[PDB]
Design a protein around this ligand. Structure first.
Ligand SMILES: CC(C)(COP(=O)(O)OP(=O)(O)OC[C@H]1O[C@@H](n2cnc3c(N)ncnc32)[C@H](O)[C@@H]1OP(=O)(O)O)[C@@H](O)C(=O)NCCC(=O)NCCS
Ligand SMILES: CC(C)(COP(=O)(O)OP(=O)(O)OC[C@H]1O[C@@H](n2cnc3c(N)ncnc32)[C@H](O)[C@@H]1OP(=O)(O)O)[C@@H](O)C(=O)NCCC(=O)NCCS
Lengths: 287, 388, 388, 287
């Protein structure tokens, strides 16, 4: 598995907010080791039976959490993320949607310099089935297994999860890198983790229109990934220069079409699949 | 969000960047009165629409009489301009920009976007002004020069000079160019822009740099902290259904096709459109049901999807989300009756109570098929529009 | 450069930071008229001088009558205030700040400096307001809290909240504190400050944060791009010889002693003072001859050094620089005659023509010894003030 | 030797200005491999028989210089330094005095992230006697040798140079780290280079009031420096809270006195000397 496991201790920033509350209950029910949360102004109270801290540093000192999940509204995210980096958190999962691109631009530079790992933003999070769930993905369609999944999209990932569970393959870890233009982690970062994780035997890469992460990931896969990779790109029928829901799902300057991505992946030897319903079939093939 | 050229030029002026003297006009009378306010003709008159290619479409003309300005204004105001960047229905022209004619010596290009590959704001300059920059990029790469704003330092003068010298500018043009670079880079960061494009950035016969056109795109996610930009939004420039959807927490984008798609998830929405396309279908729209599939939200979704007369069937693909499949099915059923959905609806449900929700659809008696799986749902909606 | 408290408070006001209503006054009449402009007394009246410790020195008083304000103003204007932070001659009081009395509930400390060890702008907060912060640092370290501005991101609200919570603030005081932090951090960066000190940052009985005092230091190297700050300089607050020296490209700092030091190089200047001290001497000043040791510049140096009546000898230690030793010797000789230097001058020259320059000194017949080496030069100037 | 040698190729930013011209002639006369200069607006001309470039990248492409010496007025330094870092220059010697502290604050972060070495600003530069001279120090008092010198001050360094030449010891390399509060390189950075340089047998550390670089250098020396170190701190008689010439020569908050520095060095085992005239004697002792 990668990123998280049964031992990962997690705090939640925006813990007392609606989504923070709701998804923390879900994580708790899954067995995730939520050890507390942060909500400026509510330090010293308890919520979902866990302590609430005014700051992430108080949270970290009190609990030893190394991972933080963020459900803080976009206007305060940069602040939240930087606070977590500064408090020593090593893994940040930012669920938040709508973070200004320029904010992520700066945060991404910080994350890299500080050696902090961030999944997101605008992503569903991470789940190592059986051991840990951080985010919003449903843990009821997952099955401990051997397929590693990386995706720029929540819902599509779920399809792939359903198929890899239905085929008995199961998932080592699911990572939703999010739909924003500048994510904390991209395909290549996650691909390298799956390649180096004994438990992951095959990888499902789910991309979509916009940017060139998939193309770069392709070149990377060709040269540094030996495990089989099945890929699927959404947006073959998407118009150019139009945001398709995800802030990052936009074909800018005619570059980053689904076809170009499919093509680049095929060239690198990735098993692409034109229909998202055939991801399970394609895995069976290469396994 | 996109700004009009006249708005980009007001912004440029606020930042000391140079642009032609001009006036945005909403009536022929204002347009003709701009003539004397500008001075001696001739005058450039320009339809204000967000799309580019206004020139090739007849929306930009140099005239030399107040009578011609007025005629142009009478001709375009309240009318729609179609360019190769709009759909065949075009964008309404509610403003005509009347500005001073400029004596062009050379046309350059200066622009910036957030480059996702380097994760930096990247400025790009070229001597190839007046051309679509993409073309120049394909054919003459070596003629495009770029610099990445360093997040740690902000834009630096040397970057401006680098581009200026690569464009072979010299003398005061180098300082002018640098100034424009620093200002535009400053605007990019301060106004949370996603895009800047000065095409053409003109060297005048008199020897000065001037922004002849201006295309600015704001980062929609930053509007909460860009009040001025927030007010500049012009909804008329877009399909009104987009804003309707948005106010209902739905992401909608119309397409050519006839199979409406209602999906929860942007990626799943696009994938669903693709699977419909793969099975001989033609997707009519992208509709990401972003909010909880409530009865009301789903009703809105249908109202919006079906406001397009070409739609002959609607494919609903819901996978998970906050609402249980059976409550989503009640929502679909309710929406179908209330919106008076007159088309076949095919539904694919996954998650809690998928089959009870399917049973609910089957038992409503409404023309709603509960499909078994994605491929099946695709084939069925495709089949459903055969010969319609 | 230092700003007056009233100037720090105007700056704070410009940045929406809170400070008591007040008026800087240059006459007793303005000071008394401030009373009614402020409102109901009592009123705080404060001598405006750059140095701290004005309170202990009697320069800050709370009065309750217009008559008392005027008397205080008549008492201090045009007079000099001596505090433990000024030399025994004090600083002229040309402004009296008359402000509203504040109902103090608690005194805090908030301040910032560039920390050279971490190479960051560091903000520091403490519940120990009204004390010299250094004392608190020595004795109660655990009560000082700090945050470093990250150059990549600028000040962040969480840093403000961190300090606020460590001070045990709660409720609206946390937002107020955060606001003050963000503003002060912003001023620090935008105005190229070297120092900020709000001591005390007060929580009022009414429950609000207010800056009761304000000490700001600007980075002198950034004044070229801080026009407003440039105008705020108050030369009267410093030894006028410093500005005289500076305008002559000389770095001068007066000391207690009686052996004037004229050296080229700050480090050599300090080292020279030290070697004189080591050999039983008492250095009268630090004078770094920063510019080329020209005849005129050296003359100025002497004029400046000898404007202090305690100087009984001048040690000139020149090592290298742009001018040759012989031309420096001609400069010293010329300066000695022209300034009518009436004291023995000991010179140590090193570099091109050191001995020809020494010969030149010896042959002028002026009372100028050309020493052989630093230790020798030290002993000789020391000897030269024996019994004078 | 450290930093520079006979092979170091150098360009000069501000090359056509007074000081840039003057000191470049001096460097050229010394045999330093000046290969060109940069002055925006004068590219394509030649000066001191070398090419002048409009930008540092043009300069680097044309000459392969890896070192740049900067004689650009303070208001444009940050720009100059960042331009050099960005053009790939690996060693920057900034002579310029008066650079805003906040500018150096940012530049220092850049330098460290980019792995670029900067000596300065407000320093006399670097000289490996016999091989290379970049800066303003006079090469006529130097002698190829075994003593490494680091100093926050120009003139004092010259004294130490005179003494180590007069005692026949000679200098491996002289490094004037400058008198600013935030220099590009501090004592510890240079100390580590001298410790690891076979040719340097003894080190002379020259500091002064302000900051805590000397104290940190002391702790560093104790634990990581084996070569003998002779130190001298100027400013025992300097008042507190007053700039003594150098922007960085100021005792802020009562910390950073010459005595505290002397004391810290003695504790770490450095051979301190109270009179600057005895540096040569102290070296003879430990050599
Ligand atoms: C982040 C997001 C979920 C928050 O929504 P929400 O929970 O309804 O918002 P709420 O106001 O209820 O909660 C936000 C909480 O953060 C808290 N908060 C604000 N700033 C904070 C900070 N710097 N640190 C910690 N908590 C902070 C707020 O105080 C609030 O808690 P409170 O209600 O106890 O005061 C929402 O804005 C969002 O991004 N939704 C889209 C998520 C998504 O679609 N992801 C794609 C995955 S595929
Ligand atoms: C840096 C400094 C020496 C410049 O002084 P100077 O040479 O008289 O100034 P000048 O104007 O003559 O020269 C500056 C040159 O830099 C050029 N310049 C300006 N910006 C530039 C940039 N970004 N890149 C390159 N060159 C630049 C100027 O154009 C000018 O050259 P030009 O005259 O050919 O146009 C001076 O400001 C200084 O700092 N002096 C103190 C040095 C010192 O005491 N150090 C302590 C060592 S112990």
């Amino acid at each position: 598995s990668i990123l998280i496991d049964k031992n990962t201790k997690v705090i939640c920033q925006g813990f007392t907010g609606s989504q923070g509350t709701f998804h923390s209950e879900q994580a708790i029910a899954y067995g995730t080791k939520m050890v507390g949360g942060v909500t400026p102004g509510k330090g010293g109270t308890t919520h979902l039976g866990l302590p609430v801290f005014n700051t992430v540093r108080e949270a970290v000192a009190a609990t030893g959490a190394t991972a933080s999940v963020i459900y803080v509204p976009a206007p305060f995210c940069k602040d939240s993320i930087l606070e977590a980096i500064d408090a020593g958190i090593k893994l940040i999962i930012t669920i938040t949607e709508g973070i200004p691109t320029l904010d992520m631009l700066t945060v991404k530079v910080k994350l890299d310099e500080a050696g902090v790992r961030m999944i997101g933003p605008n992503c569903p999070g991470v789940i190592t089935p059986g051991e840990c769930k951080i985010g919003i993905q449903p843990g009821h369609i997952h099955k401990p297994g051997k397929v590693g999944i990386v995706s720029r999209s929540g819902t599509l990932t779920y399809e792939a999860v359903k198929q890899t569970t239905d085929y008995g393959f199961g998932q080592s870890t699911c990572v939703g890198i999010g739909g924003d233009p500048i994510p904390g982690s991209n395909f290549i970062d996650i691909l390298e983790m799956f390649e180096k994780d004994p438990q992951t035997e095959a990888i499902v890469m789910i991309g979509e229109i916009g940017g060139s992460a998939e193309e770069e990931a392709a070149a990377y896969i060709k040269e540094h990934v030996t495990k089989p990779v099945v890929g699927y790109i959404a947006g073959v029928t998407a118009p150019k220069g139009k945001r398709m829901g995800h802030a990052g799902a936009i074909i800018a300057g005619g570059k980053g079409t689904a076809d170009e991505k499919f093509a680049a992946l095929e060239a690198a030897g990735v098993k692409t699949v034109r229909s998202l319903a055939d991801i399970g079939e394609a895995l069976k093939t290469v396994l | 969000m996109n700004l009009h050229e006249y708005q980009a030029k007001q912004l440029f002026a606020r930042y000391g960047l140079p642009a032609p003297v001009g006036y945005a006009c909403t009536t022929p009378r204002e347009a003709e009165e701009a003539a004397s306010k500008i001075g001696a003709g001739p005058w450039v008159v320009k339809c204000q629409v967000h799309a580019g290619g206004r020139g090739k479409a007849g929306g930009v003309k140099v005239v030399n009489s107040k009578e011609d300005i007025r005629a142009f204004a009478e001709n375009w105001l309240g009318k729609r301009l179609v360019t190769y960047q709009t759909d065949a229905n075009g964008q309404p022209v509610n403003q005509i920009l009347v500005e001073a004619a400029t004596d062009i010596a050379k046309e350059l290009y200066l622009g910036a976007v957030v480059d996702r590959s380097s994760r930096r704001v990247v400025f790009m300059a070229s001597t190839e002004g007046g051309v679509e920059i993409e073309k120049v990029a394909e054919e003459t790469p070596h003629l495009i020069h770029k610099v990445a704003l360093d997040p740690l330092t902000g834009p630096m003068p040397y970057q401006g000079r680098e581009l200026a010298f690569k464009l072979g500018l010299e003398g005061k043009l180098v300082q002018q160019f640098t100034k424009i670079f620093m200002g535009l880079a400053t605007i990019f960061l301060e106004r949370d822009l996603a895009l800047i494009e000065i095409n053409p950035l003109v060297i005048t016969k008199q020897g000065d740099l001037i922004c002849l056109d201006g295309k600015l795109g704001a980062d929609g996610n930053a509007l909460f902290r860009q009040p001025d930009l927030r007010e500049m939004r012009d909804q008329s420039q877009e399909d009104p259904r987009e804003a309707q959807a948005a106010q209902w927490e739905l992401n909608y984008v119309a397409l050519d096709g006839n199979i409406g798609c209602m999906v929860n998830g942007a990626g799943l929405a696009m994938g669903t459109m693709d699977i419909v396309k793969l099975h001989g279908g033609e997707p009519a729209n992208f509709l990401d049901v972003g909010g909880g599939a409530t009865k009301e939200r789903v009703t809105e979704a249908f109202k919006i999807i079906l406001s397009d007369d070409k739609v002959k069937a609607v494919l609903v693909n819901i996978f998970g989300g906050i609402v249980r499949c059976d409550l989503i099915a009640d929502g679909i059923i309710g929406a179908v009756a209330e919106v008076g959905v007159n088309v076949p609806v095919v539904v694919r449900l996954e998650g809690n109570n998928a089959e009870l929700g399917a049973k609910k659809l089957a038992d409503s008696g409404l023309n709603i098929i509960a499909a078994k799986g994605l491929t099946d749902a695709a084939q069925q909606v495709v089949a459903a529009v055969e010969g319609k």
